Amino acid sequence: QLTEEQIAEFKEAFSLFDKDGDGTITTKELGTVMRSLGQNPTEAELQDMINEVDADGDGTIDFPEFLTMMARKMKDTDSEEEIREAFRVFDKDGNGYISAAELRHVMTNLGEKLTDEEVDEMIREADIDGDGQVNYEEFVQMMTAK
Numbered sequence: 001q002l003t004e005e006q007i008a009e010f011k012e013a014f015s016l017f018d019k020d021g022d023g024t025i026t027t028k029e030l031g032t033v034m035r036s037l038g039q040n041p042t043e044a045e046l047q048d049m050i051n052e053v054d055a056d057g058d059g060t061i062d063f064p065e066f067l068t069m070m071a072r073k074m075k076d077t078d079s080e081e082e083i084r085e086a087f088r089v090f091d092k093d094g095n096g097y098i099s100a101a102e103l104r105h106v107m108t109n110l111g112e113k114l115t116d117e118e119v120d121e122m123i124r125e126a127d128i129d130g131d132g133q134v135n136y137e138e139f140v141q142m143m144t145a146k
């Protein structure tokens with residue numbers, strides 16, 4: 001069921017959530033990444049999210065706890081319903097077009113440090129008209145063909 005390739009992609013996320021890297025994920029660290037994802041969860045909401053895999057009585061999300069969680073949540077290529085939700089994250093201008101500048105802003109905020117050329121490569125990957133901007137149609141385009 002769980003392949004090595006999937007585990008490697010999950011471990012990357014765990015390393016992003018852990019700010020000090022103590023092995024567990026508190027509500028503070030959990031809400032830091034969720035904030036840059038266009039979401040705004042409260043203290044009470046962040047607590048319930050942790051309880052999903054918390055059954056040892058620690059109130060945090062350890063390494064094996066997150067791995068199991070990301071396995072049942074991250075399904076790689078999601079449906080169109082979730083695709084629209086993530087599309088509005090990279091497009092903070094709400095115009096429907098995601099340029100290089102916009103994309104690089106969200107990437108750096110997420111914690112992924114990249115250069116300008118790296119962003120231009122991701123943009124042209126989903127771009128069908130080669131205009132530097134990626135709309136909703138082009139967003140799904142990269143989910144069906146790289």
Ligand SMILES: [Ca+2]
Pocket residue numbers: 017018019020021022023024025026029
């Ligand atoms: Ca940590």
Ligand SMILES: [Ca+2]
Pocket residue numbers: 091092093094095096097098099102
């Ligand atoms: Ca925009």
Ligand SMILES: [Ca+2]
Pocket residue numbers: 127128129130131132133134135138
């Ligand atoms: Ca376009």
Ligand SMILES: [Tb+3]
Pocket residue numbers: 053054055056057058059060061062065
């Ligand atoms: Tb725990």
